[PDB]
Amino acid sequence: MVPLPLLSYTTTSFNTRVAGYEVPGDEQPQIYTAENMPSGSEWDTLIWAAYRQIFSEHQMLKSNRQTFLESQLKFGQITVRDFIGGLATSAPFLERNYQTNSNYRFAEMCVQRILGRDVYNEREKIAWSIVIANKGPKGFIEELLNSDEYLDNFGYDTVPYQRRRVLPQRNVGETPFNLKTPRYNEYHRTQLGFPQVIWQTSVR
Amino acid sequence: MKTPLTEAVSIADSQGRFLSSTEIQVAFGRFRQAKAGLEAAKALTSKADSLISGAAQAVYNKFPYTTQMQGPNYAADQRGKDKCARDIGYYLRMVTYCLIAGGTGPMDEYLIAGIDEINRTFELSPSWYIEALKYIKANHGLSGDAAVEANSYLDYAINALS
Amino acid sequence: MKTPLTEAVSIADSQGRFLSSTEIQVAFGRFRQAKAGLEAAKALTSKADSLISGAAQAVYNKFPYTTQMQGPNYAADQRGKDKCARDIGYYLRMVTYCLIAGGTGPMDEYLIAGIDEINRTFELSPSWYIEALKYIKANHGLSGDAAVEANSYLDYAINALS
Amino acid sequence: MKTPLTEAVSIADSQGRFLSSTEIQVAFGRFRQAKAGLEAAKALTSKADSLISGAAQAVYNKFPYTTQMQGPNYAADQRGKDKCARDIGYYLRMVTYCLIAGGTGPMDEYLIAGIDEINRTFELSPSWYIEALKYIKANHGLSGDAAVEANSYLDYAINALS
Amino acid sequence: MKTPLTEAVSIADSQGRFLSSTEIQVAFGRFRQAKAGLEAAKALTSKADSLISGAAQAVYNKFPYTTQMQGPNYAADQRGKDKCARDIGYYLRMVTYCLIAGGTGPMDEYLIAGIDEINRTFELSPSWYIEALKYIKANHGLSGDAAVEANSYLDYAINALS
Amino acid sequence: MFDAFTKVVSQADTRGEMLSTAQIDALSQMVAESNKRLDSVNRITSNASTIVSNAARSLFAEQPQLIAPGGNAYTSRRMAACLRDMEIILRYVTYAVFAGDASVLEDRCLNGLRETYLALGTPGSSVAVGVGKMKEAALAIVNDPAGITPGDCSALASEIAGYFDRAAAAVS
Amino acid sequence: MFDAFTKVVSQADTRGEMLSTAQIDALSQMVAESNKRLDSVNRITSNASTIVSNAARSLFAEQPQLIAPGGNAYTSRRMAACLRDMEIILRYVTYAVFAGDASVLEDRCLNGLRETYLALGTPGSSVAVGVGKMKEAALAIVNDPAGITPGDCSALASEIAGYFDRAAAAVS
Amino acid sequence: MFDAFTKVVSQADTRGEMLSTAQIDALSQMVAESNKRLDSVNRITSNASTIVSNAARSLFAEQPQLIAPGGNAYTSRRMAACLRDMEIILRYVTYAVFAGDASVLEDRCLNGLRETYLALGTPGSSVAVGVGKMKEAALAIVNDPAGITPGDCSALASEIAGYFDRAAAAVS
Amino acid sequence: SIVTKSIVNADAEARYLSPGELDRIKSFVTSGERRVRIAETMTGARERIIKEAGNQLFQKRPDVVSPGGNAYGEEMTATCLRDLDYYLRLITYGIVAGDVTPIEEIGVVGVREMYKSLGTPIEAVAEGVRAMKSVATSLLSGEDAAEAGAYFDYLIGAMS
Ligand SMILES: *[C@H](C)[C@H]1/C(=C/c2[nH]c(/C=C3N=C(/C=C4\NC(=O)C(CC)=C4C)C(C)=C\3CCC(=O)O)c(CCC(=O)O)c2C)NC(=O)[C@@H]1C
Ligand SMILES: *[C@H](C)[C@H]1/C(=C/c2[nH]c(/C=C3N=C(/C=C4\NC(=O)C(CC)=C4C)C(C)=C\3CCC(=O)O)c(CCC(=O)O)c2C)NC(=O)[C@@H]1C
Ligand SMILES: *[C@H](C)[C@H]1/C(=C/c2[nH]c(/C=C3N=C(/C=C4\NC(=O)C(CC)=C4C)C(C)=C\3CCC(=O)O)c(CCC(=O)O)c2C)NC(=O)[C@@H]1C
Ligand SMILES: *[C@H](C)[C@H]1/C(=C/c2[nH]c(/C=C3N=C(/C=C4\NC(=O)C(CC)=C4C)C(C)=C\3CCC(=O)O)c(CCC(=O)O)c2C)NC(=O)[C@@H]1C
Ligand SMILES: CCC1=C(C)/C(=C/C2=NC(=C\c3[nH]c(/C=C4\NC(=O)[C@H](C)[C@H]4CC)c(C)c3CCC(=O)O)/C(CCC(=O)O)=C2C)NC1=O
Ligand SMILES: CCC1=C(C)/C(=C/C2=NC(=C\c3[nH]c(/C=C4\NC(=O)[C@H](C)[C@H]4CC)c(C)c3CCC(=O)O)/C(CCC(=O)O)=C2C)NC1=O
Ligand SMILES: CCC1=C(C)/C(=C/C2=NC(=C\c3[nH]c(/C=C4\NC(=O)[C@H](C)[C@H]4CC)c(C)c3CCC(=O)O)/C(CCC(=O)O)=C2C)NC1=O
Ligand SMILES: CCC1=C(C)/C(=C/C2=NC(=C\c3[nH]c(/C=C4\NC(=O)[C@H](C)[C@H]4CC)c(C)c3CCC(=O)O)/C(CCC(=O)O)=C2C)NC1=O
Ligand SMILES: CCC1=C(C)/C(=C/C2=NC(=C\c3[nH]c(/C=C4\NC(=O)[C@H](C)[C@H]4CC)c(C)c3CCC(=O)O)/C(CCC(=O)O)=C2C)NC1=O
Ligand SMILES: CCC1=C(C)/C(=C/C2=NC(=C\c3[nH]c(/C=C4\NC(=O)[C@H](C)[C@H]4CC)c(C)c3CCC(=O)O)/C(CCC(=O)O)=C2C)NC1=O
Ligand SMILES: CCC1=C(C)/C(=C/C2=NC(=C\c3[nH]c(/C=C4\NC(=O)[C@H](C)[C@H]4CC)c(C)c3CCC(=O)O)/C(CCC(=O)O)=C2C)NC1=O
């Protein structure tokens, strides 16, 4: 089989594409790296940051915790990159985030959480959606973690973060990705026959 | 904006936890700092105009070529002197802003983050600003711990320059 | 190990910069804290054994079923009481360790990080430890700001429990 | 090391394919370039010492303060002049190396990649090197297309400086 | 679309730099190529219809079973011959497009990228197209360097086929 | 992401002049009452789990439709996510009253979470009432002086109730 | 991302036929003047830092509100970002006149940067005037003869001014 | 990653008992002299760029083979990386004397950088001599008091020279 | 069409087209591209605009989804998708014509006897239309919320 190349898409103007001539301040994302030989407590903070990035805060349940992946990471058997791949390919992630979304929206969510940037255009979502259809969600995550964009920004040992959310002269940056892209959209909300209206006012 | 309370909130937020006694230790320390630092910032506000003119004259004294050669980067003409002393007052105002804020955040966001490429593009030597900051840190006339941390901020600007 | 100097070094290292006046503000604040906190930790060290026995007796008083029913999780037999008062002394020792360290780090690394799954596996109600910590924070007998931050650490343990 | 054959191999390797007619077009173009560029590099090798001394004298002429003021960054003493003309010869040697290599790779790897932080740390104005490169590109004495691409490399060094 | 100027812009963009002398070497080489390649593409445009019919007849000659057996993949009926010679003309048109574009980009984007799965799904042997391209590269009748690079593009199509 | 001091610094830089004297006297009084601000903040922080459990306790007593099957907070996973959302809101309230500015509370929650609760199908009314009840209980827990010296928390009840009402209105 | 040659190839493929003869004579004249296009491109490229510094030099002499405190390019960081934005625009102009097509300039800047400058609060008028002045200075630097064999560069001044006006209008 | 206090806490936990009294008197004296350490550290920190430039200034006067072509620090990029390596070592020395423990200096540099300099072909001897000269200049800059209340920096001189010798020996 | 009843209103008076009316038939053609793109959005997003809006009907009137009802079950609220789609269809035909005569030819005058024979209260259906108006304008622009909703208010008044 000839490998079908990724469909070409146009790039958009984003803060992450320009050089930032910035002095470190309180709005800079805290970098969690394994390179500094982390203490036993620093490993727990790095693991916590990786779960927050990939699952969101509301999905940090005791039942979603990948204890075997955490022990492999703490023993140095796997890299932080491989841990992120293991989280994004985990059963609780696929059940909660893959099965409740279309391939297009799942691609957008993975780009935001793993590459730490927004999608350039709707054509990038279409280009990644065919990778998900052909290789499954696992092969899509592996292709995203093997991108030069991932390696150049995070390497093997850094937990992904939202790149350049705030400009140094602004008290208000871009919306956090966890608020911008919640677990599911309006389309899956209508299927669940959920919230919206569930009360009959009063009798009179 | 690296100020102590902001970075304490950033630590507690990135950890995902509530505030602990660590941030309250940071706070009683920050209030201890501000209790002299605000009055020292007011004193620098009082002496600001004479300090700016003295720094500009010391810079013209140590580098006399800038007053002589024709060039729009040099302060040979009058508009060079207006813009020049304007950025002297800029440096002094950022020093007072960091004295009020309690951290190097305001100078790091308003001065430092692009100063290298600006001096590269505009043919401005940073040693001029180093001489001016040295004259300011010599002639500010404060005393005690306020004077030491004022010199700390000015030395931080010097190390960020060169 | 969330202690103020350690986390200040972590901030300065993750930013990739030198230490600034922010960490020195953190430091004069931390020394202000420790200047009473070390003596308060010594006073808790003095009153520790009677506090442990009083907490165990208050826990047996509020939950009298644990003394009665047969069960290896309950302190009906004597080995339950030995192990039980041992973990009372564990909680008190972690309180003193956080009083010395100046942050919630030691209890967070020695107690909190696995306590939920341990109480899940061993059929231990955390409310027993909440009652014991409430008795300790009522009966420690300190005064002033040392007493308030001691109560802060104990309340932090309570909120981490339930 | 941005040289045309190296970057053609990098393109064909990153694409994962064999070489095509595109790289052969790159090659007949590169041989066309080198067919004059090697002789021009030999001519610059011949005129190198007088060009270095003339550039140093023009730099002392346009910036006469550097010969006068005491300072280890300035060439007032003799060791400043030895080191100074040494880095003039460094710049000229990198120009000849890029003339042989056929791309801006050697100057980009040997000069450009750290020159900004070095001039920042050492209080060296890059305008001195801009004046020297301007004197070299005025006085190299080549003619024709070799002269135009030599001026291209020198102008590239100028734009990388400021 | 792997054409030399496009990939030069892609190199300079991915490096984040301006254009250097390397891309100008690429350019004088590309113009040297096109200066014969455009006229060779016009000559192939002139001889195209007879080349297509000769390639189809050579393909029917070497593989006589395709004219005989009933099957919609085989050109036994007339619609097979219309579609067949249509894709012969497709191959020849892509050869001329790569001759104009100066790289293997047009055939790589219009032919190669899916040809393997198409021949897999449709029961088309690629050896038929290899025989046709061999007949074309034997019978195109060009001479000199244009003929060599035309044979280069056709051999590239052959190697991409099998 | 702003302090009180960085707010005055940004305003003085947008003015382009130095800081005026009356702003410095205001900041001196702020530095005098910043610890005062803090005492409420620490006694607010220590009872946070009790605050969120009592808030959900009164809310789900008040609106039993959420606990009812088909309700938005009915499922065990969703109910845990509900308590997580409430605890997050309380934590960012404590951060904003730590730094003395509402810009941290705005930055971290407000602009996105209204659209999040619309897209999720989460009723904004119940969580608005829950944040209001949590804020009422928080000021009620803060204002009682048990083993604390006699002082004045007036303006800081003002500020804390401001932060809670800003959160409840940005939720809607 | 298109050349001149790939543009003719895509048009001939959308037609579905071979390339007509007159397009091949046009491309032969393009191959004859493509070096003519680009020696100038080289004299445009060599003076790029002088071009952007003189452009910002005239622009901030012209509109002193940007340098004034509270202005959009007032802060040192923002002013460095301003010069970076201008240098990026000049670089993509040089790329588009290298490949001989405006599609690279469209692809890399135009569709997003108008919305970026709206969202940032960047005044599109000043950067439009700056790109216009930079383009005027670029053609003025390209057109003069100082040791180069004389030639008619009339259609390439045409093309370069076209690219600069496309950039200035897409900025707005 | 350890403090002085966390070091005593970890030792007392490995013992399994409470902290003994003499360790608490030692920590009380540490809390009395910790500012003493802080004051020394701040005058070390303020002159850091002068320290690394004078250290490289004496080192490259001392070993001109590194500046010589083919030398390890000859290339401009490599020389900038050389100054970066030295500044990093000085920064982690200042961190270790801030926290009062060598475990941060060990954690952040020591275990890997010896193998890094072996694999790079970096001569460990020159950087060892440079760290030694930088440490000598650092204590020489710290020990002189200008406009500072008299204090004994001597206890610290022992500790700072210990940290610098640990760095120079772990480099080798 | 806005032509064909300006024809009818000019036919009964036995008169030609007035020039005051002739600008209205002139400005419709030059703005005909502005209404076909906002009718493309209702053509494209026709599935989303009925599916959540049907739950806005059952939230505000849950009498229909009760057993013993007119439209009860998975197959009879399926028929509400097989009925309200025509009203979402016809509003697009009201937009591209310029007025309400494709509404008036298909679904107005017989609905008093249609829904009586069906047994469904019309105002239960009509409050589904008025809730659909509130969610159609969530897709429209601030300019086009009036004029595309101007053909909605004829349909709400026709049911009531
Ligand atoms: C006198 C002090 C020395 C001197 C100064 C000089 N600088 C410029 C031009 C600029 N200076 C800045 C600097 C800042 N802008 C800021 O916003 C801040 C922090 C608040 C600083 C430090 C900038 C951005 C410019 C460019 C803007 C502009 O061009 O006006 C000039 C004018 C030269 C010029 O055209 O570019 C002068 C004269 N030069 C000397 O000779 C003195 C030693
Ligand atoms: C209880 C008060 C109300 C309620 C809560 C509720 N929230 C969710 C789901 C989410 N809530 C958020 C909110 C935030 N995420 C953030 O990162 C921040 C700021 C830092 C906020 C405010 C998000 C993103 C989600 C979706 C993803 C997730 O795991 O949590 C639910 C569950 C919905 C579900 O289907 O899982 C609930 C129940 N809802 C109510 O019923 C009360 C009115
Ligand atoms: C507020 C609702 C009630 C109130 C508070 C109040 N506090 C003070 C003063 C102090 N409070 C503290 C508390 C701490 N300092 C610490 O370092 C810590 C550990 C984190 C705590 C808990 C201290 C020390 C002070 C001042 C210094 C001291 O007490 O030694 C005041 C008055 C003084 C002031 O403004 O700071 C007040 C009023 N008082 C009430 O009546 C409210 C109900
Ligand atoms: C000077 C001519 C005008 C100006 C410039 C200006 N731009 C910014 C900030 C941004 N500019 C961009 C633009 C691009 N990014 C790209 O990747 C590309 C194409 C490859 C373009 C055209 C972006 C994304 C930003 C924001 C992120 C960033 O670092 O730069 C600023 C600074 C705004 C700030 O708050 O930092 C300035 C000043 N603005 C003016 O005032 C002039 C009119
Ligand atoms: C898992 C679900 C899933 C679907 C349904 C899906 C569709 C899909 N079809 C696409 C392209 C395509 N789809 C078609 C199909 C057709 N076009 C026609 O002319 C015919 C009408 C029809 C043949 C039946 C074609 C020709 C393209 C190519 C468009 C292009 O490459 O430019 C693309 C663009 C990216 C790419 O193919 O490589 C996507 C995302 N992707 C998915 O992941
Ligand atoms: C240093 C921090 C630390 C803590 C807190 C800790 C708790 C702890 N308590 C345990 C058991 C226990 N915990 C209790 C405690 C009680 N049961 C009661 O009825 C009383 C209400 C209460 C008395 C305080 C008892 C009786 C056991 C033994 C039960 C067992 O087999 O698991 C165990 C399992 C080990 C064992 O089985 O012996 C752990 C790990 N361990 C630690 O290392
Ligand atoms: C191969 C590429 C290459 C370059 C460009 C290079 C430059 C270079 N010049 C240096 C110093 C210097 N550079 C200058 C040059 C000048 N000062 C003046 O006043 C004159 C205007 C100008 C004469 C050209 C001087 C005098 C020094 C010695 C000053 C010093 O201690 O740092 C240094 C620091 C090394 C040292 O201190 O001896 C470097 C790395 N090194 C390289 O390896
Ligand atoms: C522009 C580049 C391009 C190429 C190369 C191309 C090939 C191509 N050839 C096809 C079929 C075909 N290809 C052949 C060709 C042959 N069979 C024989 O027996 C002969 C040996 C040979 C004559 C050259 C025939 C007869 C068909 C029709 C068979 C079919 O139903 O699929 C089809 C399927 C479309 C269809 O069924 O009509 C494609 C896509 N399409 C393209 O767009
Ligand atoms: C990549 C390195 C490189 C460069 C720089 C280069 C330039 C270059 N420009 C040339 C010609 C030329 N270049 C120009 C350019 C112009 N004349 C004007 O009056 C206009 C203002 C301006 C265009 C805007 C002209 C008119 C010619 C005449 C010869 C020709 O058509 O090529 C030639 C023809 C051969 C020769 O001069 O020896 C060369 C070499 N060749 C190279 O290999
Ligand atoms: C946080 C702790 C940390 C340390 C210690 C560290 C060292 C370190 N020094 C390096 C290079 C270097 N380090 C030096 C330093 C020297 N070589 C000499 O000739 C002198 C003996 C000495 C100057 C004191 C030089 C010249 C290089 C460049 C090697 C090269 O680029 O080829 C590299 C290779 C990658 C690169 O610099 O860009 C690492 C990883 N990195 C770290 O992250
Ligand atoms: C983070 C900002 C900050 C700084 C910089 C700071 C320094 C500082 N150093 C002090 C004291 C001191 N600092 C020194 C330091 C030394 N004396 C020598 O002769 C030695 C050479 C040298 C140590 C190497 C001494 C001796 C004292 C005497 C008072 C004391 O013990 O604190 C004090 C005591 C209070 C005061 O001076 O008002 C301050 C404020 N305080 C701050 O808040």
Report residue C83 CA to chain centroid gap. Answer: 17
Residues 116 to 155 of A: which have CB under 8 A from any C CB? none
- The b/e string for F75-101 (b: 16+ C-beta within 10 A; e otherwise) is eeeebbbbbbbbbbbbbbbbbbbbbbb
- Cα–Cα dist A174/A57, whole Å: 19
This entry's atomic model was obtained through cryo-EM
- Cα–Cα dist E129/I78, whole Å: 54
- Cα–Cα dist D102/H45, whole Å: 46
Measure CB to CB from residue B121 to each of D65, D125, D162 and give the nearest one.
D162
Residue keyed to tokens 């939920």:
C116
- Cα–Cα dist B61/G3, whole Å: 57
Residues C132 and H35 sit within 8 Å (Cβ to Cβ): no
- The b/e string for E63-80 (b: 16+ C-beta within 10 A; e otherwise) is beebeeeeeeebbbeeeb
Closest Cα in chain C to B157: C20
Name the β-bridge partners of A158.
A33
Residues H22 and C52 sit within 8 Å (Cβ to Cβ): no
Residues G108 and G96 sit within 8 Å (Cβ to Cβ): no
**I26, amino acid identity:** K
- The dihedral built from the CA positions of residue A23, A27, A28 and A34, taken in this order, carries a sign that is positive
In the DSSP assignment, the letter for residue B125 is -
Closest CA to E100 of E32, E37, E153: E37
**G12, amino acid identity:** A
- Cα–Cα dist E57/E51, whole Å: 10
Closest CA to C147 of C56, C16, C39, C27: C39
Residues 6+ apart with CB under 8 A from E36: E144, E145, E146
Rg (CA), chain H: 18
Residues F105 and F95 sit within 8 Å (Cβ to Cβ): yes
Distance C83 CA to ligand 6 centre (A): 6
- Cα separation values, E155 from C55, D12, E79, E138, E161, Å: 89, 18, 29, 11, 10
- Cα–Cα dist C26/C4, whole Å: 7
Where residue B17 falls (left for φ over 0; alpha for ψ -120 to 50; beta otherwise) is beta
- Cα–Cα dist F122/H6, whole Å: 45
Residues 6+ apart with CB under 8 A from A114: A54, A84, A88, A141, A144, A145, A150, A160
| Phi, then psi, of A33 in degrees rounded to 5 | -120, 145
Chain D contact for H76, CB < 8 A? yes
Please provide the DSSP assignment of chain H as one string.
---SHHHHHHHHHHHTSPPPHHHHHHHHHHHHHHHHHHHHHHHHHHTHHHHHHHHHHHHHHH-TTTTSTTSTT-SHHHHHHHHHHHHHHHHHHHHHHHHT-THHHIIIIIHHHHHHHHHHT--HHHHHHHHHHHHHHHHHHHHS-SSS-----HHHHHHHHHHHHHHHHHH-
Token pair, residue H114, equals 């010896």
Rg (CA), chain D: 18
B118:G79 CB<8 A: yes
Q: Which atom of ligand 9 is nearest to the CA of E28?
A: 43
In the three-class reduction of DSSP (H, G, I as helix; E, B as strand; rest coil), residue C20 is classed as coil
- Cα–Cα dist H127/H114, whole Å: 11
Residues C21 and B32 sit within 8 Å (Cβ to Cβ): no
- Cα–Cα dist B94/B150, whole Å: 12
Resolution (A): 3.5
- Cα separation values, E53 from E79, E110, E128, G9, Å: 15, 22, 14, 24
The answer to the question of whether G88 is labelled as a binding residue is yes
In the three-class reduction of DSSP (H, G, I as helix; E, B as strand; rest coil), residue D19 is classed as coil
Please provide the DSSP assignment of G110-121 as one string.
IHHHHHHHHHHT
Token pair, residue A78, equals 């796997």
- Cα–Cα dist A88/A142, whole Å: 10
Residue in A2, A7, A135, A140 to alter for ligand 5 test, most ligand atoms within 8 A of Cβ: A7
- The dihedral built from the CA positions of residue A28, A34, A38 and A41, taken in this order, carries a sign that is positive
Q: Which atom of ligand 11 is nearest to the CA of H151?
A: 26
- Cα separation values, G165 from D152, G48, G56, G88, Å: 27, 18, 18, 16
Closest CA to H32 of F101, C32, G143: C32
- Cα–Cα dist I66/I64, whole Å: 5
- Cα separation values, F94 from D28, F6, F36, H66, Å: 70, 18, 14, 56
**Among protein residues, the one whose CA lies closest to atom 30 of ligand 9:** G36
In the DSSP assignment, the letter for residue G146 is S
Please provide the DSSP assignment of chain A as one string.
-PPPPPPP------GGGSPP-----TTSPPP-BSTT---HHHHHHHHHHHHHHHH-GGG--GGG--HHHHHHHHTTSS-HHHHHHHHHTSHHHIIIIITTS-HHHHHHHHHHHHSSS--S-HHHHHHHHHHHHHHHHHHHHHHHHTSHHHHHHHTTTBPP--TT-S-TT-S--PPPHHHHS-SS-HHHHHHTT-SS--------
Dihedral of the CA atoms G161, G165, G166, G168 (nearest 10)? 140
- Cα–Cα dist D142/D147, whole Å: 5
Closest CA to C37 of H14, B35, H27: H27
Residues B52 and F18 sit within 8 Å (Cβ to Cβ): no
Q: How many distinct helices (H) and strands (E) make up chain F?
A: 8, 0
| Phi, then psi, of C130 in degrees rounded to 5 | -65, -40
Closest CA to H151 of H142, H164, H159: H142
In the three-class reduction of DSSP (H, G, I as helix; E, B as strand; rest coil), residue G136 is classed as helix
- The b/e string for I62-74 (b: 16+ C-beta within 10 A; e otherwise) is eebbeeebbbeee
- Cα–Cα dist I140/I75, whole Å: 31
| Phi, then psi, of I114 in degrees rounded to 5 | -65, -60
Residue keyed to tokens 């012209």:
G62
Closest CA to F87 of C160, G167, G11: C160
Closest CA to B114 of A26, C21, A29, G73: G73
- Cα–Cα dist I124/B2, whole Å: 60
Q: Which atom of ligand 10 is nearest to the CA of H124?
A: 21
Q: Calculate ∠ Cα G99-G104-G106, nearest 5°.
A: 140
Residue keyed to tokens 């006067």:
H61
How close does chain C come to B61, measured CA to CA in Å?
Answer: 32
Residues 6+ apart with CB under 8 A from I107: I86, I87, I90
Token pair, residue G11, equals 């048009």
Residues A187 and F121 sit within 8 Å (Cβ to Cβ): no
| Phi, then psi, of A158 in degrees rounded to 5 | -105, 135
- Cα–Cα dist I155/I160, whole Å: 9
- Cα separation values, F108 from A45, F9, F122, F140, H41, Å: 20, 22, 19, 25, 36
Residue in B5, B20, B25, B28 to alter for ligand 3 test, most ligand atoms within 8 A of Cβ: B28
Where residue A181 falls (left for φ over 0; alpha for ψ -120 to 50; beta otherwise) is beta
Closest CA to H93 of H50, H143, H40: H40
Largest CA distance in chain I: 59
Q: Calculate ∠ Cα I103-I105-I108, nearest 5°.
A: 60
Q: Counting ligands in written order, which one lies closest to the CA of residue C106?
A: 6
H120 C-beta closer than 6 A to ligand 10: yes
Rg (CA), chain F: 18
User: G44, exposed or middle or buried, with CB in 10 Å at 0-12, 13-18, 19+?
Assistant: buried
- The b/e string for B140-149 (b: 16+ C-beta within 10 A; e otherwise) is bebeeebbbb
- Cα–Cα dist I68/D112, whole Å: 84
- Cα–Cα dist C82/C66, whole Å: 14
User: D107, exposed or middle or buried, with CB in 10 Å at 0-12, 13-18, 19+?
Assistant: buried
The answer to the question of whether F1 is labelled as a binding residue is no
Q: Which residues line ligand 8 (CB under 6 A)?
A: E 59, 66, 72-75, 80, 83-84, 87-88, 90, 110-111, 118, 122, 124, 128
- Cα–Cα dist D48/D93, whole Å: 9
Residues 6+ apart with CB under 8 A from H13: C97, C106, C110
| Phi, then psi, of H11 in degrees rounded to 5 | -70, -40
Closest Cα in chain H to D115: H76
Name the β-bridge partners of A33.
A158
Token pair, residue F107, equals 């930055």
Q: Calculate ∠ Cα G6-G132-G107, nearest 5°.
A: 30
- Cα–Cα dist E53/F144, whole Å: 99
A7 C-beta closer than 6 A to ligand 5: yes
- Cα separation values, C136 from C53, C54, C58, F9, F119, Å: 10, 8, 10, 45, 47
Token pair, residue F46, equals 């220590």
Residues 6+ apart with CB under 8 A from D58: D131, D132, D135
Closest CA to A179 of F88, B7, F96: F88
- Cα–Cα dist F52/F87, whole Å: 6
Residue keyed to tokens 């007339």:
E78
- Helices in chain G by DSSP H: which ranges? 5-15, 21-46, 48-62, 76-99, 103-105, 111-120, 124-143, 154-171
Q: How many distinct helices (H) and strands (E) make up chain C?
A: 9, 0
Closest CA to H160 of H126, H137, H144: H137
The secondary element (H helix, E strand) that includes residue B43 is helix B21-46
How many CB atoms within 10 Å of residue G81? 26
- Cα–Cα dist D140/D43, whole Å: 9
- Cα–Cα dist C117/E131, whole Å: 72
Q: Do chains E and B touch (3 or more CB pairs under 8 A)?
A: no
- Cα separation values, H102 from B64, F89, H1, Å: 48, 40, 9
Q: Which residues of A touch E111 (CB under 8 A)?
A: none
How many CB atoms within 10 Å of residue D46? 10
Residues D89 and B85 sit within 8 Å (Cβ to Cβ): no
I56:A190 CB<8 A: no
Closest CA to D159 of H52, I131, G52, F113: G52
Q: Which atom of ligand 10 is nearest to the CA of H122?
A: 17
How many CB atoms within 10 Å of residue A204? 3
C88 C-beta closer than 6 A to ligand 6: yes
The full 3-state SS of chain E, as one line of letters, equals CCCHHHHHHHHHHHHCCCCCHHHHHHHHHHHHHHHHHHHHHHHHHHCHHHHHHHHHHHHHHHCCHHHHCCCCCCCCCHHHHHHHHHHHHHHHHHHHHHHHHCCCHHHHHHHHHHHHHHHHHCCCCHHHHHHHHHHHHHHCCCCCHHHHHHHHHHHHHHHHHC
Token pair, residue C43, equals 């006073």
G78:A12 CB<8 A: no
- Cα–Cα dist A25/B104, whole Å: 9
- Cα–Cα dist D51/D38, whole Å: 19
- Cα–Cα dist C85/C91, whole Å: 10
Residues C21 and B152 sit within 8 Å (Cβ to Cβ): yes
Closest CA to A21 of D105, G35, B110: B110
- Cα–Cα dist G17/G34, whole Å: 26
Residues A27 and F1 sit within 8 Å (Cβ to Cβ): yes
Contact partners of F by the rule of 3+ C-beta pairs under 8 A? A, B, C, G
Token pair, residue D111, equals 């000069």
Token pair, residue I52, equals 């959540």
